[PDB]
Amino acid sequence: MKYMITSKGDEKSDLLRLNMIAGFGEYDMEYDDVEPEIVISIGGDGTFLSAFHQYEERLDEIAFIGIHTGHLGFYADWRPAEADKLVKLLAKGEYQKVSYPLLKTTVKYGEATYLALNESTVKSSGGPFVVDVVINDIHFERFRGDGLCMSTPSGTTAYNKSLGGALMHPSIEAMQLTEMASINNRTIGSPLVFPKHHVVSLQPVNDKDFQISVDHLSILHRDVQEIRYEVSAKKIHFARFRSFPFWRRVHDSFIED
Amino acid sequence: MKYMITSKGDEKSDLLRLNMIAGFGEYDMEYDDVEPEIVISIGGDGTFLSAFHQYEERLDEIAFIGIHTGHLGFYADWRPAEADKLVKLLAKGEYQKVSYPLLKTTVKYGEATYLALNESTVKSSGGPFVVDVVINDIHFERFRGDGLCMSTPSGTTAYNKSLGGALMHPSIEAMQLTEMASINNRTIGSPLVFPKHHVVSLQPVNDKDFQISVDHLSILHRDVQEIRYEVSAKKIHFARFRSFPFWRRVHDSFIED
Amino acid sequence: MKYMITSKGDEKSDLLRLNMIAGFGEYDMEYDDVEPEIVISIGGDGTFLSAFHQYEERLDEIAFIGIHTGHLGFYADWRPAEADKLVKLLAKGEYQKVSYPLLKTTVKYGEATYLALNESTVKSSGGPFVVDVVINDIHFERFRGDGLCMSTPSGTTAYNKSLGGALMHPSIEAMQLTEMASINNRTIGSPLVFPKHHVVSLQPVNDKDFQISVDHLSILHRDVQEIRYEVSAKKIHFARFRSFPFWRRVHDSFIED
Amino acid sequence: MKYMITSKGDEKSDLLRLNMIAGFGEYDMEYDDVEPEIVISIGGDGTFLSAFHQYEERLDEIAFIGIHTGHLGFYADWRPAEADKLVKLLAKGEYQKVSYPLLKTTVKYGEATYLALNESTVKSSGGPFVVDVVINDIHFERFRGDGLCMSTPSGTTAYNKSLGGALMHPSIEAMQLTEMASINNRTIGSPLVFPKHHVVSLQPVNDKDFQISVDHLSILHRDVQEIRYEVSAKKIHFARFRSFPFWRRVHDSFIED
């Protein structure tokens, strides 16, 4: 079947990539970066992120695989020393699939939609900003501070975590909202976990210019009227060869490897 | 059908109770506190809690209803001025049912099981304590501090919330673990959200005596070997007459009513 | 003696200002916005801030006074209804003086100094940034995240407070440092309180461009080599007529007025 | 001069102690655990704590010294391999003295005073408790939760730190108050830093029984009417031989040694 490989770009990553391609040449494996059924990423979690967005239009037909040439990553959870084993199993393996929930973000002006593997955040064009938070068409609070972060289950170990967010198992179809330096003299303060059909809307009070980020991409949006968040209907599919539990991955990254 | 009514015990609650019983006398409604199909609680969230545990053996056959004679409660979400309307609909209504997840706690010595509507916590017999946290048979961390809290979705607005926990919609079948004054000089720090089949086990290191609480009940357990948490298979059923969304209930309690 | 008055600029503030000037015309009080010995601010805490920086070169010769025409402020702690009483006492009163510590910030390139009443912060030109934190010439930590905040005692109720900082009585000559979304996978996490002669230095790792803020003024600094913080030798002097304790002011703003 | 030595009690500590005593026998050094002018502690920070309280009545005449046979401690900041060097300098050295602020706690019934090197805390006889917090005779807030902690500057790296407290340089004469699981549905939330003459009083609302702790000692106090905190007039004196800065000590304990 078809496959492609992205590389962090350093010596270690390019060489690992050139070798896997060689091993793939020993099997019925056509390299194709247009319609790959398998996407292998070599480097770190950031390299994986870029690979996700590069192919975010054929997600339902792709199985992703993350190799870390550096520190152990949440998405890049395979060691380089297992690259050749991957080649073999990927070839004639009926390997299983693991799917994670994604975050849908909608921006409206006076619509643009995006998909996020980790999170989407909103901040001001300088200084603290003010937006109204509407949950399912009901006003929930008026937020003033640095910004807000809406996170996927797998993205909870990222930006979410730094903002006091909870770590959530990716088998749970949900999204989590956290605050950035909220001034309270009135917000909920606590992070909020939303289910599959709940819609969270952010609306401008005075200023209509915001810095909106989706994972690594950061876009200054002008004359914005609304920002809508909801658990996407699309999912990211991983190739599963062995058992590497999420909590073990949490333990190795933050407690001790 | 059969029904019963518990009261906070003050003048306001007893009188509201005596009136509802009277209204129920105008319908085919046999009062029975042994096998009630309807359990109405009058007072606060604490009164509701006591009512839950009083009938925790017939949960699958009971529909609960909470009336608040004081401040608006998360479980007691009906105003007294609507008591008579409840009577009528409860009589000849095909009212819907809303179910919330519960927490199963297991204690083993050298087994006792309990159900919690809000949370279960563990603390020491004085001073900071030490326990090993095992997630699905894999050691996750060694905790030293004041204690730990395992919370249901609806219980996240309670003790969980004070410990930095996230607020979680009760339609999500999950449990959340938070820390109490963890010493870090090594824990995850972040709250953890577990799904339906994950098992979290707490194990003694040196001392085998702990103060274990399940909602309002607090029991000093001696010679404890293990404390196991998991999302219960049982659920609490509410009677649904109107629409009072969880996030609206969150807003009214913490933001402004 | 000489005095001046700044106004928030709305109807309420301008009229209060025109009246106080009139009352001052009934006494030996020459209006002078060049060398005033008394600076009265009318509006909010922000109006007071602007007044501080407008005269930050004659701080040792000025006594400040804050009037709030809106909500009670930490610096603007006089009600409009007491404006005329201020006029009288300011005229022939041997009123006392209350002084608060200030923050000195130094920026070096490849020097510019500033004074802050509230705080100074540093952030990146987009995304998370990395700087080395040196305390008294000894490397303390390498910070990665959104930014850092160095705060004066009186500024602890402001931005500091939102970042988890402690509230510190302004009679204590100190500065407090807090983190903004630190990634920990290694920082202290806890806020840090420094005494009068300690010097905290921030140094660029890869990028030399930062957004540096001093109170309300925000300046993008390029080719920065070092940012030095220390408790200033200069102090801001207030005119004291009555007793309005700091903790009472804290209580009224955050607990209930 | 007179001196004494306390030991953690294990093999390593007793032997280090027997050797130092021997070295002291080679100088004019009379061992006396009644009126020692020098108190050497061998073990950890806890061993030092016990040594502080054992001699809390002759603090003004004693110079303390902490040796760690285990991990580096904040009070026990000398390595065993430097024990003999200590002996020599302690003998004929005009060594300097370093003094840290202490916390005075007063309990009144229907008075008992105590001194704390680290902190004093108050908790309930089971479950959440309620007390009124009065700052300098002015009601500040009504607290409901697990408890409160009043901490010295050097004690901020201890229990304080786990409760979100700030780390404060011990040259600052102050005390810091932190909350334990405060329910907010109304407290300040932020830690509070008080100066030398401020008095913080805790007063019972309904229940008059509390668990009061001073460092390691924990006493259930019955029929308590008031608990008063203030920066003590007494100070603990250390012997200073070399330069081991507080922030370096913070870095080595929490960042990396």
Ligand SMILES: Nc1ncnc2c1nc(Br)n2[C@@H]1O[C@H](CNC(=O)C(O)(CC(=O)O)CC(=O)O)[C@@H](O)[C@H]1O
């Ligand atoms: N303050 C913060 N703390 C922790 N994580 C943060 C953060 N701010 C941000 Br933005 N993030 C995370 O940073 C992620 C993006 N970073 C990257 O992709 C890299 O930076 C990008 C790359 O190299 O491909 C990955 C890396 O450097 O580790 C975002 O998706 C957030 O999850």
Ligand SMILES: Nc1ncnc2c1nc(Br)n2[C@@H]1O[C@H](CNC(=O)C(O)(CC(=O)O)CC(=O)O)[C@@H](O)[C@H]1O
């Ligand atoms: N520190 C804390 N902060 C917030 N909530 C806390 C808390 N400690 C505890 Br214990 N709780 C909650 O207190 C709940 C029990 N309290 C009660 O049931 C009442 O106290 C009991 C009653 O009156 O029936 C309810 C009330 O007083 O509001 C527990 O289930 C926890 O959820």
Ligand SMILES: Nc1ncnc2c1nc(Br)n2[C@@H]1O[C@H](CNC(=O)C(O)(CC(=O)O)CC(=O)O)[C@@H](O)[C@H]1O
């Ligand atoms: N996220 C934040 N939370 C709380 N306070 C914050 C904050 N971000 C910032 Br910047 N601040 C504070 O905002 C202050 C400046 N704001 C102002 O001066 C005003 O905005 C400026 C004015 O109107 O003069 C005051 C106001 O609007 O209340 C800074 O000195 C910080 O103390």
Ligand SMILES: Nc1ncnc2c1nc(Br)n2[C@@H]1O[C@H](CNC(=O)C(O)(CC(=O)O)CC(=O)O)[C@@H](O)[C@H]1O
């Ligand atoms: N939850 C907590 N987190 C961090 N520190 C805590 C804590 N609870 C407590 Br009590 N403490 C600290 O524990 C200190 C007392 N402990 C000790 O003295 C020892 O336990 C006592 C000893 O061995 O002498 C020291 C040790 O074991 O490291 C108190 O003074 C508090 O500062």
Ligand SMILES: NC[C@H]1O[C@@H](n2c(Br)nc3c(N)ncnc32)[C@H](O)[C@@H]1O
């Ligand atoms: N594996 C840890 C490294 O990868 C980055 N990262 C990314 Br990109 N995504 C995640 C993620 N989902 N969880 C944790 N860290 C993440 C994160 O910023 C850190 O630098």
Ligand SMILES: NC[C@H]1O[C@@H](n2c(Br)nc3c(N)ncnc32)[C@H](O)[C@@H]1O
């Ligand atoms: N309704 C708020 C009052 O009820 C108590 N409470 C209980 Br009991 N359960 C909850 C709960 N689940 N969420 C919020 N508060 C709760 C909570 O302690 C507070 O005093």
Ligand SMILES: NC[C@H]1O[C@@H](n2c(Br)nc3c(N)ncnc32)[C@H](O)[C@@H]1O
């Ligand atoms: N009085 C509260 C209002 O004034 C702003 N503020 C300023 Br400007 N300085 C402070 C300050 N020092 N403390 C609290 N709030 C402050 C703060 O942002 C809030 O909007």
Ligand SMILES: NC[C@H]1O[C@@H](n2c(Br)nc3c(N)ncnc32)[C@H](O)[C@@H]1O
């Ligand atoms: N040196 C770290 C060890 O000593 C204990 N400790 C004590 Br006792 N006092 C302090 C203290 N003041 N700061 C930090 N840790 C302390 C603290 O509980 C930890 O176990």
